[PDB]
């Protein structure tokens, strides 16, 4: 098995921070990124 949970978590945390606090749209960030977020959350 080989997955970069590390970078995934990193981007995901950054995401969740800004997203949950801005409460609004994420033009910097992408669907791939939220996907990796949920991936982290499944594997953790």
């Amino acid at each position: 098995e080989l997955i970069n949970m590390r970078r995934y978590r990193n981007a995901a945390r950054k995401l969740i921070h800004h997203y949950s606090l801005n409460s609004t749209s994420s033009t910097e960030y992408k669907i791939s990124d939220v996907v990796m977020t949920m991936i982290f959350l499944l594997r953790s």
Binding site: L21, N22, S23, T24
Partner: protein, 58 residues
């Protein structure tokens, strides 16, 4: 009072409960000023959404 029996002001503006009432307050006040300065052209058509922002950085 006519505006849906305007509810307690400062908390209604507080709490991030609903953008809708905030936008309505804004629009209605602006139309009121429009009318006071001149009732001759009572209103203005253009629809739009409006932005709230939550950060000192703005």
């Amino acid at each position: 009072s006519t505006l849906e029996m305007t509810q307690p002001l400062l908390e209604i503006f507080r709490n991030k409960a609903d953008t809708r009432q905030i936008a309505a307050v804004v629009f209605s006040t602006l139309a009121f000023i429009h009318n006071r300065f001149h009732p001759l052209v009572t209103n203005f058509t253009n629809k739009m959404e409006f932005v709230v922002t939550e950060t000192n950085d703005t």
